Amino acid sequence: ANAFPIGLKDESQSDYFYQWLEDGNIGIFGSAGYGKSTTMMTLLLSFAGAYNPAQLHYYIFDFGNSALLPLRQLPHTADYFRLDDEKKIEKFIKFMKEEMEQRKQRFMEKEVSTIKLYNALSEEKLPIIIVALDNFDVVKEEMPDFETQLIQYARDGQSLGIFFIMTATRVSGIRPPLMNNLKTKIVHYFIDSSEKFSLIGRTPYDVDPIPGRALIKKDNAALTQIYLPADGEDDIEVLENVKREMERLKEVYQHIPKPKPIPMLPPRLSMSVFTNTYVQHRASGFIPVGLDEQTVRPVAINMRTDPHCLIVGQSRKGKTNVVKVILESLLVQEPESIGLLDGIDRGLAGYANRDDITYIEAKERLAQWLNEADAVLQQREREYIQAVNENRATTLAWPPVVFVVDSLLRLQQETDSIMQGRIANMMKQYSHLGFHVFVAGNANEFVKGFDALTAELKQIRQAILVTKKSEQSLFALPFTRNEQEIEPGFGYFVVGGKDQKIQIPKVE
Ligand SMILES: CNc1ccccc1C(=O)O[C@@H]1[C@H](O)[C@@H](n2cnc3c(N)ncnc32)O[C@H]1COP(=O)(O)OP(=O)(O)OP(=O)(O)O
């Protein structure tokens, strides 16, 4: 449970025990082909057998030669990193900074120093995070940014319940801060004599003749034979039984929730893949518009609280795509009617033939749809008023009567003062009775328009921007000089003052 036996000490004989937490970070050292990765594999499997996946999280950085590739199958492993996975390692650095910062807040909120205290008092436990790193030499030379973070994890992490394990072929070159934080040190055979001398550490010879100066030996070193991770007579038999060992851990920890992999944005994102894999909420009155940039989770429009939405931007392709993302997501719901007013370019002609979609082009056809829409909304208004006057609980949600517009300029041309005022009144009257409006156009069109219809649209506080925040005077948002360019399938989701970057999926 606590004392993990990792090897047989040379002197009957007793096992060398590694105390949980107390013995701190582990530092595996030695020349090539002397059991650095086996010691790594023995440690990680030993801890996995005692603690749950929910209690113990691994993040294996295998930069050696795929020696820790079997450990990828473990339920304890959150993610597995290689030298080629640079973008994944960069995100991990961001993840740990946020995770450590969040930990420090929770510790300070409940007035505690160590993780052992926090988990004891708090009912919701935090997982122990071991950062396994095979081959430190390659990190030392080729990855100085990651090296800086590894020193921070070893120093500050242990108190927050974030331990660190690493193998290294050349100790001469490792910084004293990193070396000192490595509490436990497993030292395998070395070829060079100079490499051994540095691992001896402080001795009574280091003590100068000064009253008060002294060496404090906590515990003596021990010559130990490290156990193999599984029984076997050769490398293949051990590797086979190591696989069989993990199959048991998978079976034993079946109901225990597994750790989340590091969230990553795909290079290409379609609507079909977005709806199937990522979108796993499928709630009524929620239109998923795209994945968040940082967290990589579906962001959605709450139709009950925020019924209307603007699609602002210069890009014709960008706006039209966002309309299709909304139309596709609206079809998953059970709408009463959808009045699609397409622009002068007939881009959304494919949605015309589909069910529950009235394709609008001329002015006369728009008037017919407004009559059908208003007739339904008038009935809902009666049921709402009758419910309040009879002291009854009002209906929570209705089938959405949506009015999608691909072009604001086309809407103004196809309507007059009377018809524009009618639509504006419908928004004022029926916004709480399942009426929705999705307009698309340039930023200046909303601002320049002082007509009855456009005056109502400019007051809508929710929007999907497919343009820069600096290049619009509609929503007062935070921005800077060095703002990111608006590439295809990228925009901002504005709602209730706040905003966030999102990856908008392409509708084929
Ligand atoms: C990943 N290699 C193995 C995994 C399980 C069993 C054997 C091996 C193996 O390749 O054979 C060697 C010993 O049998 C096996 N071994 C360890 N302890 C042993 C022990 N107590 N008895 C017998 N063999 C042992 O270690 C191996 C040499 O060191 P290793 O490759 O583990 O690490 P490294 O090369 O020092 O560093 P890196 O992999 O990062 O380059």
Numbering used by the authors: 968 to 978, 983 to 1479
From the primary publication:
The protein is predicted to consist of an intracellular repeat of forkhead-associated (FHA) domains at the N-terminus, two transmembrane helices and three P-loop-containing ATPase-type domains, D1–D3, forming the C-terminal intracellular segment. We present crystal structures of the N-terminal FHA domains (EssC-N) and a C-terminal fragment EssC-C from Geobacillus thermodenitrificans, encompassing two of the ATPase-type modules, D2 and D3. The observation of protomer contacts in the crystal structure of EssC-C together with similarity to the DNA translocase FtsK, suggests a model for a hexameric EssC assembly.
A crystal of the EssC-C–mant-ATP complex gave improved data and hence this dataset was used to finalize the structure at 2.9 Å resolution. The asymmetric unit consists of two EssC-C polypeptides, labelled A and B, each resolved from Ala968 to the C-terminal Glu1479. The polypeptide is composed of two homologous P-loop ATPase-like modules or domains (D2 and D3), which are connected by a linker (Gln1225–Ser1241). The structure derived from crystals grown in the presence of mant-ATP displayed additional density for the mant moiety in one polypeptide. ATP was included in the other since there was no clear density for this mant moiety. The adjacent residue in EssC-C D2 is Asn1106 rather than the canonical acidic residue that primes a water molecule for nucleophilic attack on the γ-phosphate. The mant group is accommodated in a hydrophobic pocket formed by Val1209 and Leu1210 on α9 and Ala1038 on α2. In D2 the corresponding polypeptide does not extend the core sheet but rather forms an extended structure which we term the ‘β9-segment’ (Ile1171–Tyr1198) that protrudes from the globular fold so that β9 (Gly1183–Lys1188) serves to extend the central β-sheet of a symmetry-related molecule D2 domain through association with β8 (Thr1155–His1159) and β10 (Thr1195–Ile1197). Despite the inclusion of excess mant-ATP in the crystallization conditions we only observe the ligand to bind the D2 domain and this is consistent with binding data that suggest a stoichiometry <1.
